[PDB]
Amino acid sequence: PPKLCLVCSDEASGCHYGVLTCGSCKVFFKRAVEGQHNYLCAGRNDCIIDKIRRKNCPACRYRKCLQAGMNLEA
Amino acid sequence: PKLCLVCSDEASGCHYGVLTCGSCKVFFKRAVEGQHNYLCAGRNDCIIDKIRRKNCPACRYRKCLQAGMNLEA
DNA sequence: CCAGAACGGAGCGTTCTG
DNA sequence: TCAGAACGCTCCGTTCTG
Ligand SMILES: C[As](C)(=O)[O-]
Ligand SMILES: [Zn+2]
Ligand SMILES: [Zn+2]
Ligand SMILES: [Zn+2]
Ligand SMILES: [Zn+2]
């Protein structure tokens, strides 16, 4: 019964930064929190984040990582 | 103070038949020749501006066409 | 099993040329 | 004039490494 990334719903590879996620979201989040995450949504801050569309809006993908509970120290 | 009709950045000239910037010029060339189809994460209504145009190639491309951008022109 | 690094690919935007 | 090539850059995601 495949476990699913809580950010993007791709198949999860494990528990990363405290949350069931895929590898791309693990490493997106690491990039976002270390960089200057000055991301802008071109829509209404409710973009659909899935495997096909997660590249599209880092702002909304980052928000979802935060709402899911991701954090570096866990 | 002429502005790109796709993204409202500073326009560099007339490209493919529309007053556009350089990034929109080359983006549209790439979009057309490359047959890759895009999908909006929002509502096919994204705000395309200097910073946000990176975010939705689907909406940016739709705007290039509605502006009348055209190869052979 | 997980974090962090590395690596190759894609896309974007400038610059230069004629 | 503007079309096009090309390059350096950022970001992405899979794979390694510790
Ligand atoms: C294009 As790939 C499989 O190296 O992310
Ligand atoms: Zn994911
Ligand atoms: Zn968004
Ligand atoms: Zn433009
Ligand atoms: Zn869009």
Author numbering:
A (entry chain A): 417 to 490
B (entry chain B): 418 to 490
From the paper:
The GR is a ligand-regulated transcription factor (TF) that controls the expression of thousands of genes. GR has a domain structure common to the NR superfamily: an unstructured N-terminal domain, a zinc finger (ZnF)-containing DNA-binding domain (DBD), a hinge region and a ligand-binding domain. To modulate transcription, GR binds directly to DNA at canonical GBSs composed of two pseudo-palindromic hexameric repeats separated by a 3-bp spacer (5′-AGAACAnnnTGTTCT-3′). GR binds a canonical GBS as a dimer oriented in a head-to-head fashion.
Next, we biochemically characterize the extant human GR (hereafter GR, unless labeled otherwise) DBD bound to an unmethylated CpG-containing GBS (pre-GBS) and its methylated counterpart (5mC-GBS) and find that GR has preference for the 5mCpG GBS over the pre-GBS. Binding to the 5mC-GBS and pre-GBS showed Kd values of 131 and 206 nM, respectively. To determine how GR recognizes the 5mC-GBS and pre-GBS, we solved crystal structures of the GR DBD–5mC-GBS and GR DBD–pre-GBS complexes at a resolution of 2.0 and 2.5 Å, respectively. Both complexes crystallized in the C 1 2 1 space group and each structure contains a dimer of DBD protein molecules in the asymmetric unit. We found that in the 5mC-GBS structure, Arg447 makes side-on hydrophobic contacts with the methyl group of the 5mC, mimicking interactions with a thymine base seen in extant GBSs. This hydrophobic interaction is lost in the GR DBD–pre-GBS complex that contains an unmodified cytosine base at this position. Without this interaction, Arg447 in monomer B moves outward but still makes hydrogen bonds with the guanine in CpG dinucleotide by one amide group, suggesting the methyl-derived side-on contact helps stabilize the Arg447. Each GR DBD monomer contacts the methylated pre-GBS with one more van der Waals contact than with an unmethylated pre-GBS, which results in larger buried solvent accessible surface area (BASA) between GR DBD and nucleotides in each half-palindromic site (140 Å2 versus 109 Å2 and 125 Å2 versus 115 Å2). The affinity between GR and pre-GBS (206 nM) suggests the pre-GBS may be a functional glucocorticoid response element (GRE) as it is a variation of TpG-containing GBS.
